[PDB]
Structures are given as structure tokens and as C-alpha cells.
Amino acid sequence: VKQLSSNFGAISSVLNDILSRLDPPEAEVQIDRLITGRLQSLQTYVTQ
Amino acid sequence: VKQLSSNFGAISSVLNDILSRLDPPEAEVQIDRLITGRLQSLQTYVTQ
Amino acid sequence: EDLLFNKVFNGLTVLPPLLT
Amino acid sequence: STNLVKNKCVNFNFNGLTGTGVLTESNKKFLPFQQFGRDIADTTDAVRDPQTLEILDITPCSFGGVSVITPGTNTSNQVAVLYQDVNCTEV
Amino acid sequence: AYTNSFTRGVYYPDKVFRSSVLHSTQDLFLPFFSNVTWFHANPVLPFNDGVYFASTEK
Amino acid sequence: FGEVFNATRFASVYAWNRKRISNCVADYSVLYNSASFSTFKCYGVSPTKLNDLCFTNVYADSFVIRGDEVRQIAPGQTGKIADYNYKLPDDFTGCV
Ligand SMILES: *[C@@H]1O[C@H](CO)[C@@H](O)[C@H](O)[C@H]1NC(C)=O
Ligand SMILES: *[C@@H]1O[C@H](CO)[C@@H](O)[C@H](O)[C@H]1NC(C)=O
Numbered sequence: 520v521k522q523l524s525s526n527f528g529a530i531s532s533v534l535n536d537i538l539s540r541l542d543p544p545e546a547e548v549q550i551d552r553l554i555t556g557r558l559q560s561l562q563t564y565v566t567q
Numbered sequence: 568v569k570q571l572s573s574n575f576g577a578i579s580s581v582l583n584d585i586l587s588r589l590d591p592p593e594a595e596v597q598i599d600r601l602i603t604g605r606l607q608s609l610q611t612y613v614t615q
Numbered sequence: 616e617d618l619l620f621n622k623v624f625n626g627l628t629v630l631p632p633l634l635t
Numbered sequence: 636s637t638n639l640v641k642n643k644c645v646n647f648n649f650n651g652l653t654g655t656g657v658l659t660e661s662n663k664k665f666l667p668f669q670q671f672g673r674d675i676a677d678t679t680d681a682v683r684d685p686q687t688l689e690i691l692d693i694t695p696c697s698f699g700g701v702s703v704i705t706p707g708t709n710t711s712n713q714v715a716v717l718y719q720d721v722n723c724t725e726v
Numbered sequence: 727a728y729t730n731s732f733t734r735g736v737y738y739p740d741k742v743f744r745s746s747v748l749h750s751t752q753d754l755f756l757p758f759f760s761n762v763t764w765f766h767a768n769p770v771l772p773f774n775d776g777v778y779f780a781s782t783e784k
Numbered sequence: 785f786g787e788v789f790n791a792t793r794f795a796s797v798y799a800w801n802r803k804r805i806s807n808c809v810a811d812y813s814v815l816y817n818s819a820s821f822s823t824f825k826c827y828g829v830s831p832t833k834l835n836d837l838c839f840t841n842v843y844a845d846s847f848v849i850r851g852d853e854v855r856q857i858a859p860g861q862t863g864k865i866a867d868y869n870y871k872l873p874d875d876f877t878g879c880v
């Protein structure tokens with residue numbers, strides 16, 4: 520649950536505020552870092 | 568330990584070399600490439 | 616028990632076992 | 636360039652070899668053309684300094700973990716502290 | 727004439743000291759058991775990538 | 785916004801000034817499409833987003849620079865003017 524509040528190197532931790540600030544041309548950049556970090560979080564949970 | 572000397576797609580493997588021939592806005596992008604690789608390697612060690 | 620004991624840096628440390 | 640101090644954690648730099656640690660005198664013997672040594676896992680563990688022509692051992696500067704021994708806060712507030720694999724002089 | 731090297735043309739590829747170990751390198755070497763020209767006594771040769779060169783006399 | 789963009793005398797780079805601006809309604813429509821601004825660009829926030837994004841506090845700065853040097857007012861580069869007079873933190877979230 521708590522890893523849902525890391526930026527993983529983006530501008531915001533909330534995707535509603537990632538889509539509020541950096542949009543599609545640049546959301547393909549900021550949303551992708553959130554996707555990358557959250558996927559890894561979930562995979563660590565499932566392996567353990 | 569032998570993974571502390573791979574680039575993972577960076578200009579070198581030493582932080583004192585990215586902090587010496589790059590300005591702070593350009594060294595972030597190169598430090599993150601090392602951080603991601605080293606985190607991956609440490610977490611593989613901990614799973615096995 | 617002797618024949619048996621004769622036959623067989625950067626953020627990394629080794630902790631000793633509790634029983635010697 | 637500058638002088639060289641031994642037996643203290645320093646930031647050294649020999650010709651471009653850059654690191655930090657404590658430098659002592661050694662019992663190795665390089666070959667006249669060899670300028671520094673490294674061990675298995677390829678870490679630098681010796682060096683030659685370019686003015687004395689003497690080789691020096693490099694040892695990382697002490698580090699470790701800190702653990703606190705508590706008899707339970709419901710019994711006391713006293714604690715003890717362990718500095719893991721550190722000699723007592725360096726605390 | 728041509729002759730056969732056996733284990734010849736190994737050089738220290740860096741300034742690094744190493745104690746009792748087995749170290750692996752990638753570099754430009756003269757392969758073992760190679761086909762080395764023989765000259766007696768001479769002509770213009772190529773270079774193309776480094777050169778081994780031995781010689782014998784008093 | 786109307787007066788800062790139409791103030792008659794702008795300060796020089798080294799003496800740039802801050803218009804403390806808060807507690808108001810910001811309307812970027814005309815400011816966006818005034819059809820006169822040779823260089824509108826910014827970061828952190830999309831150019832079409834600010835129109836409704838509410839903000840905590842906003843600061844406005846102004847100066848006058850040489851022409852070609854304009855690019856140096858942006859995060860992460862150098863130039864005699866961006867070196868000694870004005871540079872922007874790399875976590876910048878405004879518009880230029
Ligand atoms: C912990 O403290 C409570 C409150 O004083 C006490 O009731 C309890 O017995 C204590 N637990 C022990 C002594 O193990
Ligand atoms: C700790 O340092 C002292 C002081 O030199 C030394 O005599 C001793 O051998 C070291 N190690 C231990 C385990 O005491």
C-alpha cells in the first residue's frame with residue numbers, strides 16, 4: 520500500500536496530478552515511470 | 568560485487584566520474600541508470 | 616571431528632553464529 | 636601535489652586513482668612497471684606513490700551496524716549499544 | 727620459409743599488479759601455434775594490427 | 785497580469801524583481817493566444833493545463849536580456865547570463 524506514494528522519479532505521485540501537470544506527449548514520459556515502479560512493487564509482493 | 572563495475576548504459580561505472588564530467592542536470596540521468604541496475608542486482612541476490 | 620574440520624568490503628558484512 | 640599521511644581515513648588521489656580509506660605501509664613487491672595492485676573481485680587494495688616509489692596498502696575506513704539492546708521499555712529505560720565488528724578504540 | 731610459434735607473444739596488458747590468481751583478458755594477441763614468416767640475411771611488410779617480432783644473434 | 789506584461793520600464797537581469805501575486809483569478813486565454821509572444825514555453829505543467837489548475841502561491845519575475853541568450857533561461861544549461869545573474873532550479877514548475 521505505501522509504495523503507492525513514491526514518485527519513482529516523476530513530478531507527482533498521484534497520476535490524477537501527473538495527468539494534471541504533464542500531459543500525453545510528456546505523460547508518456549511521466550506516467551511510464553510510475554508504471555515501471557508500481558509493477559516492480561507488485562512483483563516483489565507476489566514473489567515473497 | 569562484480570556487478571559494481573557495469574555501466575547498465577551509462578558513461579562509466581564510477582560516481583566520481585559522472586560527478587566530474589557532467590553538470591547536475593545531466594548527471595541525474597546517468598546516475599539513475601546505475602541506480603536501477605544496482606537495485607535489480609541486489610534484489611536478485613536477495614530472492615535467490 | 617577433526618578430520619571433518621580439516622577437509623572442509625562495501626556494505627557487505629558477515630555475522631557470527633550464536634553457538635560457537 | 637601534496638604530502639601523504641598514513642593511518643587515517645583520507646580521500647586519496649594518486650595520478651587519477653581516486654578513492655577513500657586508510658593507507659598503511661606494506662610487504663608487497665610490485666614489478667618496476669606496475670603502478671597499483673588489485674585483488675579478486677577487482678578492488679584496488681594497493682598503490683604506488685609516484686614520488687617515493689613505495690607501495691602502500693589501502694584499507695576501507697571502518698563501518699558497521701549499530702544495535703541497541705533493550706530490556707523492554709515496560710521494565711526500564713536503560714539500553715546497551717553494540718557496534719558490529721568494530722574495534723572499541725574507534726568509537 | 728614459415729615456422730610455428732608455440733606459446734609466444736604474451737605481454738602485460740596493463741599496469742595492474744596481481745598476486746596468485748587466474749585473470750581473463752580480451753585484447754590483441756598472437757594466437758598460439760601460429761604461422762610466422764621466416765626471413766634470412768629486407769622487404770616492406772604490412773602492419774594492419776600490431777606485430778610480433780623476434781630475432782636471434784650475438 | 786495585465787500591468788506586469790505592460791509595465792513601461794523593466795529591470796535588468798541582475799536586478800530582477802518579484803511581483804508578489806496571490807488571491808486572484810488567473811485567465812491564461814489571451815496570455816496564451818495574444819499572437820505576439822515570440823517565445824512561450826514551459827515545464828512541469830502542460831500549456832493547456834494551467835487554465836483550471838488551482839495554485840497555492842505564484843511568483844512573477846521579469847527582466848531584459850540579450851536576444852540570442854533567451855534559451856539560457858531554462859533549467860540545465862549555461863551561458864554568461866544564466867551563469868551569474870539568474871538560474872532556475874531543476875525542479876521548476878512554472879512558465880517562461
Ligand atoms: C507491562 O506493563 C503493564 C502495565 O504496568 C503491566 O500490567 C504488565 O504486567 C507489564 N508486562 C510485563 C511485566 O511483562
Ligand atoms: C583492537 O585494537 C587494539 C589496539 O591496537 C589491538 O591491540 C587489538 O588487537 C584489536 N583487536 C581486538 C580484538 O582487540
Ligand SMILES: *[C@@H]1O[C@H](CO)[C@@H](O)[C@H](O)[C@H]1NC(C)=O
Nearest residue numbers: 728729730759760761762763
Ligand atoms: C602457412 O601458410 C602458408 C600459406 O600458403 C602455407 O603454405 C604453410 O603451410 C602454412 N604453415 C603452417 C605451419 O601451417
Ligand SMILES: *[C@@H]1O[C@H](CO)[C@@H](O)[C@H](O)[C@H]1NC(C)=O
Nearest residue numbers: 785786787788789790814818
Ligand atoms: C496591454 O497592451 C495591449 C496593447 O494595447 C492591450 O491590447 C492589452 O489589453 C493590454 N493588457 C494586457 C493584459 O495585455
